[PDB]
Write a protein that binds this ligand. Structure first.
Ligand SMILES: [Ca+2]
Length: 212
C-alpha cells in the first residue's frame, strides 16, 4: 500500500505537548506526475486533495508552497494557485520537516540499492506574518542552530524504515539530499530533517525534486 513518500510539511503534536496540527505536501513515488495536499487539525485529517501537475516532478526542481493563514491554506505549484482549503484550518505553530520514507508493496519491483532513492531540496523559505520571523535556508551545510537530523529510531505504525542521520547529506552544489537505503535483512534506513524552532502563519516555499 503506502510505498515511497517524499514530503515537505509542518508538524506539532503530543510529543511537543500540543494537539496534532500538520500541513502536508507529499509525493508518492508510484506516480510523481501528481502531488497530494492534506492537513490535520487536532488529529483530524481526511482532507486529501491530489493534483495533476502536468509534468513529472522527479525530473527537475519545482517550487511548491503553502500559504497558511487563519482562515485558509492555499497551495501553489511554481507560483500558480492549485488548491484552497477553508475548513477547520490548523492554528498551532509547528516545526518545518522534510522526510523520505517507505510504508508497509510494489515499489520494490524496481528498487535497486546501488542507485538509491533520493529526495533533493535546494532551499526553503518562510515568510512570516510576524515581522522579523522570516528565514531563508539554502542547504549549503548542516546548520545545527536551526535544524536537526532524525536518528536511531523508527516512527513505527505506517513507517517501515529507521531514521539514520547518515542518510541526510549535503551536496557540494548546495542541496539537501535524503536517501533511502537497504543493505540486508529487508531493513530500510530512511531520513528526516527538521527545524528546531516552531513557526506559525505565513508562506512556506520549498524548491525540491521527490524520489522515484
Ligand atoms: Ca541550495
Amino acid at each position: 500500500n503506502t510505498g515511497i513518500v517524499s514530503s515537505f510539511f509542518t508538524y506539532t503534536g503530543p510529543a511537543h505537548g500540543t494537539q496534532w496540527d500538520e500541513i502536508d505536501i507529499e509525493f508518492l513515488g508510484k506516480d510523481t506526475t501528481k502531488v497530494q495536499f492534506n492537513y490535520y487539525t487536532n488529529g483530524v485529517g481526511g482532507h486529501e486533495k491530489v493534483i495533476s501537475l502536468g509534468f513529472d516532478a522527479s525530473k527537475g526542481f519545482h517550487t511548491y508552497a503553502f500559504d497558511w493563514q487563519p482562515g485558509y491554506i492555499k497551495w501553489y505549484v511554481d507560483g500558480v494557485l492549485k488548491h484552497t482549503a477553508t475548513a477547520n484550518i490548523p492554528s498551532t505553530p509547528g516545526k518545518i520537516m522534510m522526510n523520505l520514507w517507505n510504508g508497509t508493496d510494489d515499489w520494490l519491483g524496481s528498487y535497486n540499492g546501488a542507485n538509491p532513492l533520493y529526495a533533493e531540496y535546494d532551499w526553503v523559505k518562510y515568510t512570516s506574518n510576524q515581522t522579523g520571523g522570516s528565514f531563508f535556508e539554502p542547504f549549503n551545510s548542516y546548520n545545527s542552530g536551526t535544524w536537526e537530523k532524525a536518528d536511531g529510531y523508527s516512527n513505527g505504525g505506517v513507517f517501515n524504515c529507521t531514521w539514520r542521520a547518515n542518510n541526510v547529506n549535503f551536496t557540494n552544489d548546495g542541496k539537501l539530499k535524503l536517501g533511502l537505503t537497504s543493505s540486508a535483512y529487508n531493513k530500510f534506513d530512511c531520513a528526516e530533517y527538521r527545524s528546531t524552532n516552531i513557526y506559525g502563519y505565513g508562506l512556506y516555499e520549498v524548491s525540491m525534486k521527490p524520489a522515484k
